[PDB]
Amino acid sequence: NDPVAVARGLAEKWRATAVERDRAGGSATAEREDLRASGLLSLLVPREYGGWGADWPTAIEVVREIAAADGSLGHLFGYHLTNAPMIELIGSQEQEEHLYTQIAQNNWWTGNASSENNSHVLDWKVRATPTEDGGYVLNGTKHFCSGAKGSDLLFVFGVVQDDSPQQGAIIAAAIPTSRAGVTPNDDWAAIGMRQTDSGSTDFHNVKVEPDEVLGAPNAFVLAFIQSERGSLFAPIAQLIFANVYLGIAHGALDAAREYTRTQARPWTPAGIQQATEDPYTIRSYGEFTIALQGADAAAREAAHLLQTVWDKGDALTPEDRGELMVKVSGVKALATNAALNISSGVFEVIGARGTHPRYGFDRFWRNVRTHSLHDPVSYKIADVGKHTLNGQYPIPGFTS
Amino acid sequence: NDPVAVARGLAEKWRATAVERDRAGGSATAEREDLRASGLLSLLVPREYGGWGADWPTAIEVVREIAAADGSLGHLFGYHLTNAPMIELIGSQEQEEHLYTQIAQNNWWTGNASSENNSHVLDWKVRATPTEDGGYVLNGTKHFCSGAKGSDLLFVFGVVQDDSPQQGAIIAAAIPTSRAGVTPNDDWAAIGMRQTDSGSTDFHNVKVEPDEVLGAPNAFVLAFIQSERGSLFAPIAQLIFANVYLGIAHGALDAAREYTRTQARPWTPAGIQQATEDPYTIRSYGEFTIALQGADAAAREAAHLLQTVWDKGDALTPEDRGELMVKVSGVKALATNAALNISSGVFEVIGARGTHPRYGFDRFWRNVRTHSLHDPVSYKIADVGKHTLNGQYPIPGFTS
Amino acid sequence: NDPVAVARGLAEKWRATAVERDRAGGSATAEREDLRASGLLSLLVPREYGGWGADWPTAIEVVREIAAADGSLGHLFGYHLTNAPMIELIGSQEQEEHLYTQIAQNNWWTGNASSENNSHVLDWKVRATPTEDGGYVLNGTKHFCSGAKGSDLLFVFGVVQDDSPQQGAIIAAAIPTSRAGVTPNDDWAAIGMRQTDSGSTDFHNVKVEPDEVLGAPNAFVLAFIQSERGSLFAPIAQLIFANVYLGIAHGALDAAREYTRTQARPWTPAGIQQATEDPYTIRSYGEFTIALQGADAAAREAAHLLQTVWDKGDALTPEDRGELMVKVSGVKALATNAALNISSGVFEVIGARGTHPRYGFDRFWRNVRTHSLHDPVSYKIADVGKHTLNGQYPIPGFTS
């Protein structure tokens, strides 16, 4: 019933292995299995199809608890959350019902190999060839996927790239990851986010049934142009990312605080008696907490705003979407700066012995530092700027 | 029906004379008359005594709306709102019924010549001598008052300087400001907050009648010791200061934004055609927005927390009060830093021509630079650090 | 003899009047008379023509000493130093020997009504009509001059605006401020730099004799395209400004340190006994010192590079000029940011009583805050960027 208490349960189980898992890399096989058994993969699926029917504020608190324990798992779980709502954003009422039921009844992980955020559609490596029955065949390798490996239902985008009428169209599809010719590779390596399985997936003559296709050809692109419901993709994904960073910064701050209390030593040349009494340590913790106090309050207001817009369904206006995306862009900036500042800053109050790999203290920083490059925070800042000054809204796309 | 519309009406009325009034300094006689006419002075008086019975977040949104038009007037009304609560915090039911009725029915301003926040009690200048009717006579000059000049009801503290059992006791009282022997000087000069009327008040043989004495000798100090309801003084007042700063910062950003859109020139040596399209200008506007976005959302949650605590009445616990002060201390820090950063930083986007006094663009920075020095923000920061690191709450006083 | 010692002695005298002069505005007639009688006006004229013959690093040290006492006088004197070198940068040998000699024999103040640093030339307010005798006739109001009012010798630019073959040409001339038709106005008004006399000058049929024309028509512009000696204009002026801001920052920091040692109170609720022992005050003074330490060391290294570049005369390469301008651009940024930060920041350690106008503690910030808008620091930062990343040098112009 309360999914947060369920998430905190796993979080506590996982803290015993946090250092090892960041050290070893590869797939968080046992942890993915705990999330599976927990029920939480169906957190946003409406109750009537077996899910928890959670609102966005609650789902976001789940993501934060998980991200505090483990940035890779918060990311993996968070991004899994953004996949299914695509069904109801752009798909049919029949697909909604069927796919939501299956997700919730089977506790499926969903993965994606969808957008290429920074390439021209004619240059995306995953091509879709029209089929006689109205389906497509996919071929080509998507280089940056998210959770494809280990997923059950895979959300993939192909681009029609031959000379027919749908030339350049983006075909959105939800398909079984185990279908013949889908090959998720085990080739993800990064300084951080090491267990998010964000490697490549090969598609070899992969059939997509006409019924597996979500909306018309190019339905994502057309929803963006209009600011229709499918244009909520970016603010939803961006707000979850922001909250993964916040959850990581909390876990850095709690890790450092427990170390200051147990293992840090006072700077005896300055006459300090105990490490928890140093005036500058104290000021530091004060600054970390305050920066998070500001960033988390903004994240929470953005989540309520996302819920209000969500609840409008098809009646949302470009202006409702614009204003949400402006607020999220600010949260994302806030979260990115605070998380990078705290995860590097706590070292100053941990001290030289805390640089031993056994504590794995650089993992928070490496995780935030890795994902915060997913898209450039300088353009999140400029979107907010353009809105403040010119009342302009960002142009809807995969990242804004 | 809506106090914020009424404050917003006052805001537009004051706009044409914002510059000249900061230039001139002295009292804002006419703007104070405007406010007393609006009914706003009784905003927090409960309905059953004739007031609006608004709650904290609503009264705070009025303070910000005003602060934004005029930092001195935000602060003046702001601080006026914190005075009458003293009556229910430490006064008696009869005093409450008597004083609040009078305040709401006679559209009174309240002022104070109350605590000296950084001097030992036995050095406070206002000395109280007990008179055997159970009353008091006050002698001395309080150097820093707030709003005493121009007020109708004056909340005063004196210290017992004889050698009776009461010796050392702070004695709090509400008196009509025109009482014989009370002289509010017009001697307030400061770089900013020029119209806050924060000068000295002399007390010559001033009679405080027995029924004007709020609670027993030393009531506030004893309340601080226990975290009883008296000990809400500091977080109410500091939350209002923090929202005055934020209103100032929004007044600064609005002023800049209108100037950049109408008056600013493009930097032609860099190929810029529209000052509104300069990439750095846009960036600075985003960073100002984002800083306020965090500090405002934090301030909003703290007003809701203050309402929850206040609503508990006498059943509040030391933890309730302690967690509220730590939250408010962080909001005071966030608001300080955001307001100074924005009120100084807008000049960069305004440009050389906006340094002309006809714009009075430095009034926002001068108003925040002045009042932020009321109590040191480094100890707000440290209080939050001591709680984060050590679990410890601030020691209750006039500023924490 | 020692120019810095003469400067310290004037600084002593002037510091007594510093608050009074900042609240006065208008011209610092008496202070400009002190400078004239000092002989310092010819500090950079070579000995052989009667001047002090000082190198760039010594002239700069004098500027800093003066700016620390008084930001307006610092800029007024420092901008004066920039003017005469235009004679040797673009004029003939006869004019150099003649004009240097007069400046030095007569102790002339030099003023400028020169460039419009953000207008296309055909829009410059000051038009040059050519006359048959080889001269020009000037008409227009140049809106922002520097020290035209109270100068003896005026460096003026005008644009040929007619249909002729020299159309668009910037004419450079050195003329007597006292020439008929030259009207410097007393219209300078600003939040800071109030005694820099940076108002407008009217030209009404002002005659420029062929022999007072500094070089060929449009020689400055040709100098910039070629990275010629004339293109040392911006580095020199930009390095002097940086030094003005540092000197003002030192003044703010010295004023604060005096106040902290004599007047500041300890914060007794923090249990502090002495203001000079508060840990966060000591940290703050440390941060201010450290920011200046870095910006000062960078300023000094750039003044030796300027000496080295200056001492090649016409043998300088575009590369020598580019590199210098890059370094100085970085100094302008360091100084701007250190000066704004220190001049605002010192209030934190001064405290509420120091907001009283009798201290004039905000003059430092207002001074730096006003002048730092002459040209946008963001494009200084971007120029350093483009060099760092791409190896491009700034395009030589009036401010780069």
Added chain:
Amino acid sequence: NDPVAVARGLAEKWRATAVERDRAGGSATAEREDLRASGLLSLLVPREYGGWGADWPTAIEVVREIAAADGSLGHLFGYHLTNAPMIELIGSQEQEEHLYTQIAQNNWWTGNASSENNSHVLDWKVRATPTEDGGYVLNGTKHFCSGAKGSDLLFVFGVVQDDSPQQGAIIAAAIPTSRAGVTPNDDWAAIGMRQTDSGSTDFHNVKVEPDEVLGAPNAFVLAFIQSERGSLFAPIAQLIFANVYLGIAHGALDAAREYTRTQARPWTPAGIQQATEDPYTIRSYGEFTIALQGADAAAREAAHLLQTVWDKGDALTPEDRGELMVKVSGVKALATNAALNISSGVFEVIGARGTHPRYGFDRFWRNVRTHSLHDPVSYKIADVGKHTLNGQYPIPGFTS
């Protein structure tokens, strides 16, 4: 013949193995031999004893050049340099001749196992039992050494701890690393500085002959109290650490710049065509450069000061020493803050593909983030503050 050129020659090869050896950790055995064969090891040894006789500024420029290729090597080399000068600070004439000569003639690495910077002397792990011939016997395990492993000459401190009249005295000694009972262990581990060999050294009844003892019992401690020449220990060490951090910051900024220009893709959602033309990329690079500009200029100035004070021999006064340490302390804070800032910030301009471990882009941050904890920068800031405010010099000790 030019040591920076020689070190230039070596960096080009180390830069190419940088990634692997960081991912590898362990000792840099081939690299350490590269430096031996270079001859740089006797850089600071007087020309007259067969060394280079370089000055401090030159020696420092070599440390930066190495540090920019490899932070671990820079640290190792730079620390090595601090050792032999111990002989002239507190050792005799005879010791200088003999040991400088052996260091230079035999191209020895020197290592240390000297101070415990944050333990009372009676807690140090390395104890010294006085022997009847005026020698000592060392027992204990020093937990954190620098470059003891693979050294030829080893500088060791021991405390007298028994009954002896010498109780409390720190004994400094240089002994051959091959001496029986000396066991430098291979147990160094940390997130950064991975090849610095800063592990434990065991001493088992290690005999120190009377003429291997550098000065009197407790020489350093006595030299500190007096601010005699021995008290140059801290500023030499600290200034060396500051420049290792700056060389690392330069390597990070060089590695970023190469990637931005050859690998980085423009953000096409914002219309950017070339990664090198992004306005915000260009701004970040200007900012990194400008912060290093200030820091590097302040460090070069402190190296000249250190030369001056060094050259006074025993004529240095307590104030010369106090002044040098305040300067060095500001450089340490400037170098620490710049290097943290730039090594994390660059990732912003590299983008997501740059997080792949084949670039090892995080090694720069890991290196600085690790050694920056050696002693707390907040007390570097505070010493500087106590000097600025009160004129106090730091208490001389192993780190200040």
